[PDB]
């Protein structure tokens, strides 16, 4: 399946970060840090580059908080 676009926005839609394509271009990654007292985030994943009906493209999403080792987690999903 083709690589989709990734971006991070708050609950109001204000953009905060955008995805970066790695040199081994098989995945897209994102990073952000919290500055305000309370931050509510929304993660956007879309593949609407054009109007092609590709069909049943399926992707895996990995997300973590205070977990910079998401590249090689090892452990099964922990915490809440």
């Amino acid at each position: 399946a083709p690589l989709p676009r990734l971006r991070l926005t708050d609950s109001g839609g204000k953009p905060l970060a955008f995805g970066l394509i790695d040199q081994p271009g098989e995945s897209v990654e994102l990073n952000y840090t919290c500055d305000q007292d309370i931050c509510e985030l929304v993660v956007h994943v879309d593949g609407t580059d054009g109007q092609k009906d590709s069909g049943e493209a399926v992707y895996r999403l990995l997300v973590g908080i205070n977990a910079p080792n998401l590249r090689e987690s090892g452990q099964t999903p922990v915490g809440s």
């Binding site: 609950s11 109001g12 839609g13 204000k14 509510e40």
Partner: protein
């Protein structure tokens, strides 16, 4: 633009099911869906004061929301509404840019003073649904028509009324305190089920008329008189049996006139039979045979001429 511009409203309506027609009070009831959309920058807000992208109002009419938020909104009403209107899924939601939309599912009864049942059961009617804005045209005006669904929906099973065609139009009509208000009209053209009436009424009536007609081949006039007397009673029995499908409107239709003519001819048959019986009693059988031939020749011609006259006077 130096001058202020009227706000543009997009409207659309769909009909789901016709649930009843009252032929004496001249009204019908319908179930459907209505949708409105307009753009107003005065309704815009900032996301950071609520942490949301959509602000919504539920279970409230447009007038109530306008009174609560103290801003002008495009209220509407049904022109020929009779009694209260049942509403479901009523919601108004607004985007930060100022785009607003209205949704409603309704069940309403509408007056139809234009009904005409003169040609019953071959009559064709018009079902008109009118939506009028309750504001002058200088504030809000209908601009576009949106087709969110099929205007006329299909349902399983047969229907008493069959829709042949439909149309939608936007016009302007005079408004109270002068000025003008927009009107959105949906018109449905309908007709009845002809096979039901034909097979249920006309074939048995034709058979009864044929029974009354065929008895003139007999030369024993007592049997002819007895069969005519019985067939008149059979005709009356069939007439009241089908009286259930005979609407009481206070004025005559085609079916009533046809029944009256058939009854009159059936009674004249008995009268002629009595006259022929007396003539045969006196000894003038030749005149009776001549009368038999005359009746056999004349009766279908009279029926055909009456049918032609009715067609000329009611269908052209």
């Amino acid at each position: 633009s130096v001058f202020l511009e009227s706000d543009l409203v997009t409207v659309g309506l769909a009909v789901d099911q016709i649930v009843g027609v009252d032929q004496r009070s001249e009204n019908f009831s319908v179930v459907g869906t209505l949708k409105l959309s307009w753009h107003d920058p005065k309704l815009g807000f900032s996301p950071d004061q609520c942490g949301c992208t959509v602000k919504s109002f539920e279970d409230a009419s447009i007038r109530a929301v306008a009174g609560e938020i103290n801003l002008p909104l495009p209220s509407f009403s049904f022109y020929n509404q009779q009694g209260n209107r049942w509403s479901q899924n009523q919601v108004i939601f607004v985007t930060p840019d100022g785009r607003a939309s209205y949704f409603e599912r309704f069940t309403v009864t509408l007056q139809a003073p234009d009904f005409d049942f003169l040609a019953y059961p071959f009559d064709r009617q018009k079902f008109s649904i009118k939506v009028d804005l309750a504001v002058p045209t200088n504030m809000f005006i209908f601009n576009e028509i949106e087709r969110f669904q099929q205007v006329v929906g299909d349902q399983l099973g047969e229907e008493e009324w069959v829709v042949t065609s439909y149309s939608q139009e936007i016009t302007e009509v005079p408004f109270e305190r002068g000025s003008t208000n927009s009107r959105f009209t949906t018109t449905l053209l309908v007709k009845r089920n002809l096979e039901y009436y034909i097979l249920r009424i006309f074939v048995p009536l034709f058979l009864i008329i044929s029974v009354s007609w065929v008895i003139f081949f007999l030369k024993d006039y007592g049997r002819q008189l007895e069969v005519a007397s019985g067939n008149l009673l059979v005709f009356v029995a069939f007439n009241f049996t089908i009286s259930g499908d005979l609407p009481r409107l206070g004025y005559l239709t085609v079916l009533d006139r046809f029944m009256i003519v058939s009854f009159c001819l059936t009674a004249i048959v008995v009268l002629i039979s009595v006259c022929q019986k007396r003539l045969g009693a006196v000894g003038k059988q030749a005149v009776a045979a001549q009368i038999d031939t005359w009746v056999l020749v004349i009766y279908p011609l009279v029926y055909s001429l009456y049918i032609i006259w009715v067609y000329l006077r009611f269908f052209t």
